Design a protein around this ligand. Sequence first.
Ligand SMILES: OC[C@H]1O[C@H](O[C@H]2[C@H](O)[C@@H](O)[C@@H](O)O[C@@H]2CO)[C@H](O)[C@@H](O)[C@@H]1O
Length: 466
Amino acid sequence: IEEGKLVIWINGDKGYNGLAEVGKKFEKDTGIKVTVEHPDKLEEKFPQVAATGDGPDIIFWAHDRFGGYAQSGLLAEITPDKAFQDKLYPFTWDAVRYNGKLIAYPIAVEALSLIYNKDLLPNPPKTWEEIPALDKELKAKGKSALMFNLQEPYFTWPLIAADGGYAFKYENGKYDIKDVGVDNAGAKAGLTFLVDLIKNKHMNADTDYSIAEAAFNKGETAMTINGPWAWSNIDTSKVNYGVTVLPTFKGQPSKPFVGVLSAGINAASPNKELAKEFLENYLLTDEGLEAVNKDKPLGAVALKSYEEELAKDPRIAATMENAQKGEIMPNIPQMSAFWYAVRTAVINAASGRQTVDEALKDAQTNAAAEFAIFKKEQAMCLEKIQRANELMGFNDSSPGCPGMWDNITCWKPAHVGEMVLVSCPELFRIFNPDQDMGVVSRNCTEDGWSEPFPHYFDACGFDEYE
Ligand SMILES: OC[C@H]1O[C@H](O[C@H]2[C@H](O)[C@@H](O)[C@@H](O)O[C@@H]2CO)[C@H](O)[C@@H](O)[C@@H]1O
């Protein structure tokens, strides 16, 4: 944003108040102010606003998004000295290395665990297969066995990958974009098992993060699946909780993705030197990380000295046990297509819009082949919005709802009270050869843009011509 000031974005689930405390120490010593914000959907927001030169100076996200940011050139190469590099674990530096260059500072290693209420379930299940019978028993006490976020595929991935699902195949040191493991026997069985839990009313398809959290933290469900950041709210709730290895599926460990929370510096920030100093000399210290960790736990931190200090925490131990059974996320630019593909597949199979076999058949192609469409359409969208904003100027107009790219298609700026129609985008043709007949709308209201009507898959994904 502005010279002589640091703006930082970080997810609203993380220790942002803790990070702001490090910010306050920074400005006390340097005179240079630090504002920490937690925009919704910042990982997508970032490439849009950072592409126009207006991001934060620093963005925090798991490392999987950073190769895409790097490729788009939205990230400054970082310059830590040999002394500093030695203070963090090699494995965490690898997570932020892209085409041979370091593109962010690693902060902490995250993996999902099984979090369970010890009073409801003193001996938690070792197997996913045991869960339906546990739920039946608990429901007779007005309690349920398990609730977790079903809207974000990050949370369902451990079960999909358990019996052999994978994202991109890694062989001979590189990811093969064409070899996507979301549609093999293991992945199918995993997603089928999830869909059966919903069918049998052990879970509801619409369950999201805040719903699952609220249910666990009020003592209503015996288990959830969540990361280290969630432990602080559970502490506040006084639930007697344990954090443990995820259940097995078909005898195999669940295989969560491992993320390294990382901090990248905007390539357009004028304050790259200030950004460096904050990250290297304030945040990545025992004291900086303690401040953040005490707000919302980070997991296993990248800084060796502090990771050693924390290592006996049994909840971190469980985290590390689940991470060892899991796999590091790729950081390749195509991970954005992978996550689109699998989120679509899980939401569709869970809601009955597609069968599991069709959902996954399509996701395998979409993970491999959709990124180029996304990139083309995103770039065309930014151009259309620029043109539209210019014409609003020429017409003495102002946008009721701003022009935006929503990862699927382009919405021109609109007046309050105006509906906008767009053609179904080419993206949906894999589902529907007649997607070119489809139309999707949004309404520009006093409360901003409405959600798409119909929902995108309903509008665009079912072949409407037999
Ligand atoms: O569900 C897809 C989503 O998964 C990961 O995001 C995680 C993030 O890594 C965690 O730190 C925590 O914030 O929860 C997120 C899931 O809601 C990937 O990092 C992300 O790029 C992907 O879209």
